[PDB]
Write a protein that binds this ligand. Structure first.
Ligand SMILES: *[Se]c1ccccc1C(=O)Nc1ccc(N)cc1
Ligand SMILES: *[Se]c1ccccc1C(=O)Nc1ccc(N)cc1
Lengths: 129, 124
């Protein structure tokens, strides 16, 4: 009903990006982890990878994390839901360069976090402000 | 035609936050600083203050940064555009971050765009 909770591992769909492996956390500054922007709701996540990035992301753009094997399937539904064939084709981009390297880092870290207890991976990966 | 460029100080309005001082910058991973989310244009900023946060923000949610003084004014016209939700005290660790990032923003407004691109951009 509240689909996610702090510590839940999620994929984030961010514009301009492939699906990115994440963890739900509380905002260091706001102290919440979900809010109403006034009734399609956000969750605050951390992005995995050696970049310590964080964001508030819409429920509509999160998907609970099951493993790297989800990935290909996730991108199809992103395409299954695009209007024209100018948005459904806009996803055929190769993940290369620094972006792939960060992404791989993120995916490896997410599986590292997936095999953990929630209260474990909470205390190991949550950024300390 | 493009309302900002790499090195421009702007205020950004992120929901649930008070207006934040930022610099327009190139996304290190995407290698762009502006894009169409497709007819709502975004720019990529980095939020001043010691936590190096960066985001794509909408053009509708950015104002150019002349100095701390506009804060009041900016907020009042935001609250007139919903409403009572922005009537909260900026306190604690958020006020500390905010005040820190404002300070860095005023400092970069004296420099040339070259000066501030060197000093203030993030090494990624
Ligand atoms: Se979602 C996906 C599946 C297969 C191949 C590529 C993608 C993808 O999102 N690629 C991509 C590459 C680069 C950038 N900047 C965004 C997206
Ligand atoms: Se924008 C503003 C002007 C005057 C006083 C306060 C504000 C403000 O936004 N405060 C605020 C406090 C806490 C949070 N989470 C958001 C905003």
């Amino acid at each position: 009903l509240l689909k996610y909770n702090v510590g839940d591992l999620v994929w984030s769909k961010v514009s301009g990006y492939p699906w990115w492996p994440c963890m739900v956390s509380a905002d260091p500054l706001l102290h919440s982890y979900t809010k109403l922007k006034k009734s399609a709701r956000q969750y605050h996540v951390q992005f995995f990878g050696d970049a310590p990035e964080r964001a508030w992301i819409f429920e509509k753009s999160l998907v609970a994390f099951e493993g790297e094997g989800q990935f290909e399937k996730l991108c199809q539904e992103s395409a299954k839901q695009a209007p024209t064939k100018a948005e459904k084709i806009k996803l055929l981009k190769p993940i290369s360069g620094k972006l792939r390297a960060q992404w791989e880092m993120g995916i490896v870290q997410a599986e590292e976090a997936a095999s953990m207890s929630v209260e474990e991976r909470k205390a190991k990966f949550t950024f300390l402000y």
